[PDB]
Design a protein around this nucleic acid. Sequence first.
DNA 1: GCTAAACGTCGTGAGACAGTTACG
DNA 2: CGTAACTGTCTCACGACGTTTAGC
Lengths: 152, 152
Amino acid sequence: NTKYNKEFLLYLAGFVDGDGSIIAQIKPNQSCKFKHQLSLTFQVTEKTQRRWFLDKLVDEIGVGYVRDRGSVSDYILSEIKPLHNFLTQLQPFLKLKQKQANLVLKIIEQLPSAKESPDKFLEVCTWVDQIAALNDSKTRKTTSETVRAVLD
Amino acid sequence: NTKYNKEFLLYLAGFVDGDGSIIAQIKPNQSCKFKHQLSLTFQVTEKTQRRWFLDKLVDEIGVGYVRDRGSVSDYILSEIKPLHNFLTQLQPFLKLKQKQANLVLKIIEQLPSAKESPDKFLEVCTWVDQIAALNDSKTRKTTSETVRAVLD
DNA sequence: GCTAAACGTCGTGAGACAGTTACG
DNA sequence: CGTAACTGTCTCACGACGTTTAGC
Ligand SMILES: [Mg+2]
Ligand SMILES: [Mg+2]
Ligand SMILES: [Mg+2]
């Protein structure tokens, strides 16, 4: 559980507000109690020629990984605990995505309790709804609404 | 000459490296001594539904303006003096566009010189090529080469 | 049964200049 | 005349996703 340099966060908050994305997704999964797993993601996207910058982030944030997908690459961070540690420290420097960041933290803290009450699950699935709402969401298919089909 | 807040500069540098663009252009123009105007531009593009972030920048940088081009907007800054002043302070924090930033300071500084000889001008046009080669240039027409076709 | 590294992609939201003009 | 503003717009470079495989 590491604490990052302040100037590092200021710069990164800016980069994230630029080419980054704080994502929340309701992933349909047929093994989970409620037929869906919650998934959280901090990601930065850059043309593959600039893959080194992303590779560097791995080192600096000290967790996460970089993958390839064509002419573009991504730094990806989904591990729930390191993700909370990171966002908690980045969150106060963000400007275009401060809200989704705090919605993500909020979702993580309310994770265990989301496992019990099927209604507390919905509520948390609401959190993710708000996030896609704030982003420039377009190709979204699985919403908290579809989780309504958790009625049987 | 306005002094900028270092935290503002760190965050902005990150944002610039993301949605920003540092550009130098060789604009053909039949009223200049060498039939080409040297143009410099610092810009940040953002979806129009987010132009408040660009308006904010107009207020914080103190110079520059915002233009609308449909679904997206741009903060633009081309005035030589404020530009050179702004880049000098921002440059030390850029990670991805530092070189083009520095090439711009270098060009702006050689303006008068290049304004007194077809050779300096030529060399300076060569500076513009490097910037272009550093960016993800895809629709560039005029180059130092096209300018050399002035030799006659 | 839930986290999570992989893997695949719709529709832009950007980056990046082209071209022409009004004026200081 | 010379430097910036006004105006255009191509070609993506990312954003905000969906689905499969790994594995304890
Ligand atoms: Mg952006
Ligand atoms: Mg971007
Ligand atoms: Mg970018």
